[PDB]
Short mmCIF file of all heavy atoms in Angstrom, two decimals:
data_model
loop_
_atom_site.label_atom_id
_atom_site.label_comp_id
_atom_site.label_asym_id
_atom_site.label_seq_id
_atom_site.Cartn_x
_atom_site.Cartn_y
_atom_site.Cartn_z
N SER W 359 13.17 -15.91 49.28
CA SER W 359 13.13 -14.62 49.93
C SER W 359 11.92 -13.81 49.53
O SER W 359 11.97 -12.82 48.82
CB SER W 359 14.46 -13.85 49.64
OG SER W 359 14.77 -13.89 48.27
N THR W 360 10.75 -14.23 50.07
CA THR W 360 9.46 -13.54 49.93
C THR W 360 8.72 -13.50 51.22
O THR W 360 8.84 -14.43 52.03
CB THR W 360 8.60 -14.23 48.85
OG1 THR W 360 8.35 -15.58 49.17
CG2 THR W 360 9.24 -14.21 47.45
N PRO W 361 7.90 -12.48 51.45
CA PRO W 361 7.12 -12.33 52.70
C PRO W 361 6.23 -13.56 52.95
O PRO W 361 6.15 -14.06 54.08
CB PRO W 361 6.31 -11.05 52.54
CG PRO W 361 6.26 -10.80 51.06
CD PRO W 361 7.58 -11.37 50.55
N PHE W 362 5.64 -14.10 51.89
CA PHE W 362 4.88 -15.37 51.93
C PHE W 362 5.71 -16.54 52.44
O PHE W 362 5.33 -17.18 53.43
CB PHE W 362 4.31 -15.65 50.54
CG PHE W 362 3.51 -16.91 50.50
CD1 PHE W 362 2.14 -16.89 50.85
CD2 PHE W 362 4.13 -18.13 50.15
CE1 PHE W 362 1.39 -18.07 50.80
CE2 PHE W 362 3.35 -19.31 50.10
CZ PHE W 362 1.99 -19.28 50.45
N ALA W 363 6.88 -16.80 51.87
CA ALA W 363 7.76 -17.84 52.34
C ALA W 363 8.17 -17.64 53.80
O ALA W 363 8.21 -18.59 54.59
CB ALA W 363 8.96 -17.87 51.40
N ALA W 364 8.34 -16.39 54.23
CA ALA W 364 8.61 -16.05 55.64
C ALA W 364 7.37 -16.28 56.54
O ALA W 364 7.58 -16.76 57.69
CB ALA W 364 9.09 -14.60 55.69
N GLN W 365 6.14 -16.09 56.08
CA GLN W 365 4.97 -16.52 56.82
C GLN W 365 4.98 -18.04 56.95
O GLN W 365 4.83 -18.56 58.06
CB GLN W 365 3.65 -16.14 56.11
CG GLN W 365 3.42 -14.65 56.02
CD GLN W 365 2.64 -14.21 54.78
OE1 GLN W 365 2.94 -13.22 54.13
NE2 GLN W 365 1.65 -14.94 54.36
N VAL W 366 5.17 -18.77 55.85
CA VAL W 366 5.12 -20.24 55.85
C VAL W 366 6.16 -20.81 56.81
O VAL W 366 5.83 -21.73 57.59
CB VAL W 366 5.29 -20.79 54.43
CG1 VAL W 366 5.40 -22.30 54.39
CG2 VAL W 366 4.08 -20.38 53.57
N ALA W 367 7.37 -20.27 56.80
CA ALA W 367 8.40 -20.63 57.76
C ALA W 367 7.96 -20.44 59.21
O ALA W 367 8.08 -21.31 60.03
CB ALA W 367 9.62 -19.77 57.44
N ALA W 368 7.28 -19.32 59.48
CA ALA W 368 6.70 -19.06 60.81
C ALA W 368 5.58 -20.09 61.16
O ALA W 368 5.57 -20.58 62.29
CB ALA W 368 6.17 -17.64 60.86
N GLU W 369 4.73 -20.49 60.21
CA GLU W 369 3.73 -21.54 60.47
C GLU W 369 4.43 -22.88 60.87
O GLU W 369 3.98 -23.56 61.76
CB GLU W 369 2.88 -21.81 59.24
CG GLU W 369 2.16 -20.62 58.65
CD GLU W 369 1.36 -19.77 59.63
OE1 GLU W 369 0.98 -20.27 60.72
OE2 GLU W 369 1.05 -18.60 59.33
N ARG W 370 5.53 -23.21 60.20
CA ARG W 370 6.26 -24.45 60.47
C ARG W 370 6.88 -24.42 61.86
O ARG W 370 6.72 -25.42 62.60
CB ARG W 370 7.30 -24.65 59.36
CG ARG W 370 6.64 -24.97 57.98
CD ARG W 370 7.55 -24.75 56.81
NE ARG W 370 8.74 -25.63 56.88
CZ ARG W 370 8.89 -26.79 56.28
NH1 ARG W 370 7.99 -27.35 55.53
NH2 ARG W 370 10.01 -27.47 56.44
N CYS W 371 7.45 -23.31 62.29
CA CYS W 371 7.88 -23.15 63.68
C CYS W 371 6.65 -23.18 64.64
O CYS W 371 6.77 -23.85 65.68
CB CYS W 371 8.61 -21.80 63.86
SG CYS W 371 10.36 -22.08 63.49
N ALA W 372 5.51 -22.59 64.30
CA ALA W 372 4.36 -22.61 65.16
C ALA W 372 3.88 -24.02 65.46
O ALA W 372 3.58 -24.40 66.60
CB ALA W 372 3.27 -21.77 64.53
N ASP W 373 3.94 -24.90 64.44
CA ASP W 373 3.67 -26.32 64.60
C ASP W 373 4.75 -27.00 65.54
O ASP W 373 4.39 -27.72 66.45
CB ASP W 373 3.64 -26.96 63.24
CG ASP W 373 3.24 -28.44 63.27
OD1 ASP W 373 2.61 -28.90 64.22
OD2 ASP W 373 3.51 -29.14 62.25
N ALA W 374 6.02 -26.71 65.34
CA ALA W 374 7.07 -27.29 66.18
C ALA W 374 6.93 -26.94 67.65
O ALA W 374 7.11 -27.78 68.53
CB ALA W 374 8.42 -26.87 65.61
N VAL W 375 6.48 -25.73 67.99
CA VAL W 375 6.35 -25.26 69.39
C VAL W 375 5.05 -25.72 69.99
O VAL W 375 4.94 -25.79 71.22
CB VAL W 375 6.53 -23.71 69.55
CG1 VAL W 375 7.80 -23.24 68.95
CG2 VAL W 375 5.34 -22.92 69.00
N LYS W 376 4.03 -26.08 69.16
CA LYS W 376 2.79 -26.62 69.70
C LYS W 376 3.19 -27.90 70.47
O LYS W 376 2.62 -28.09 71.57
CB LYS W 376 1.78 -26.90 68.56
CG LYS W 376 0.42 -27.45 68.98
CD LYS W 376 -0.32 -26.59 69.96
CE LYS W 376 -1.78 -26.92 70.06
NZ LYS W 376 -2.47 -26.12 71.07
N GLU W 377 4.11 -28.67 69.96
CA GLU W 377 4.64 -29.89 70.63
C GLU W 377 5.44 -29.47 71.87
O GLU W 377 5.30 -30.22 72.90
CB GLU W 377 5.51 -30.69 69.65
CG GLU W 377 5.66 -32.13 70.05
CD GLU W 377 6.32 -33.03 68.99
OE1 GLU W 377 6.99 -32.49 68.09
OE2 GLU W 377 6.16 -34.27 69.09
N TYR W 378 6.23 -28.39 71.85
CA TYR W 378 7.15 -28.04 72.99
C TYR W 378 6.55 -27.00 73.95
O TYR W 378 6.43 -27.36 75.12
CB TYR W 378 8.52 -27.54 72.43
CG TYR W 378 9.28 -28.60 71.70
CD1 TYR W 378 9.19 -28.73 70.33
CD2 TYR W 378 10.16 -29.45 72.39
CE1 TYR W 378 9.90 -29.68 69.66
CE2 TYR W 378 10.89 -30.44 71.70
CZ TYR W 378 10.76 -30.54 70.33
OH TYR W 378 11.48 -31.50 69.67
N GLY W 379 6.27 -25.75 73.51
CA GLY W 379 5.66 -24.74 74.40
C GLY W 379 4.91 -23.67 73.61
O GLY W 379 5.45 -23.30 72.54
N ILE W 380 3.79 -23.14 74.08
CA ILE W 380 2.97 -22.16 73.33
C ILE W 380 2.45 -20.98 74.15
O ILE W 380 2.01 -19.99 73.51
CB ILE W 380 1.81 -22.88 72.60
CG1 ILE W 380 1.27 -24.09 73.39
CG2 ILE W 380 2.20 -23.29 71.20
CD1 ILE W 380 -0.14 -24.48 73.06
N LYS W 381 2.44 -21.04 75.48
CA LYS W 381 1.84 -19.92 76.30
C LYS W 381 2.53 -18.57 76.14
O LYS W 381 1.82 -17.57 76.05
CB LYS W 381 1.84 -20.28 77.79
CG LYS W 381 0.94 -21.47 78.19
CD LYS W 381 1.03 -21.84 79.66
CE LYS W 381 0.54 -20.76 80.61
NZ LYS W 381 -0.81 -20.26 80.29
N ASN W 382 3.87 -18.48 76.11
CA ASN W 382 4.63 -17.19 76.08
C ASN W 382 5.70 -17.15 75.03
O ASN W 382 6.26 -18.21 74.71
CB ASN W 382 5.26 -16.92 77.45
CG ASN W 382 6.01 -15.63 77.55
OD1 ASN W 382 5.40 -14.56 77.64
ND2 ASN W 382 7.35 -15.69 77.56
N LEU W 383 6.03 -15.96 74.47
CA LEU W 383 7.11 -15.78 73.46
C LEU W 383 7.75 -14.36 73.56
O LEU W 383 6.98 -13.47 73.89
CB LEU W 383 6.52 -15.98 72.06
CG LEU W 383 7.47 -16.41 70.97
CD1 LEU W 383 7.68 -17.94 71.01
CD2 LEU W 383 6.96 -15.97 69.61
N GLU W 384 9.04 -14.21 73.29
CA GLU W 384 9.74 -12.88 73.22
C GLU W 384 10.53 -12.87 71.91
O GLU W 384 11.62 -13.38 71.91
CB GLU W 384 10.67 -12.62 74.43
CG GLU W 384 10.08 -11.71 75.49
CD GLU W 384 8.80 -12.19 76.14
OE1 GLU W 384 8.63 -13.39 76.39
OE2 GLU W 384 7.94 -11.32 76.45
#
């Protein structure tokens, strides 16, 4: 539970969506 770990989690999702979709997000 740290802002850094929450950034890293977001990077891991960003990689997963590069494979699926990247143009739009809500």
Side-chain angles (χ1 to χ4, degrees):
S359 49
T360 59
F362 180 86
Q365 295 150 221
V366 173
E369 306 309 336
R370 291 163 62 94
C371 273
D373 187 20
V375 305
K376 181 57 163 177
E377 202 171 18
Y378 295 93
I380 33 157
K381 295 177 62 54
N382 181 75
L383 205 83
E384 259 60 36

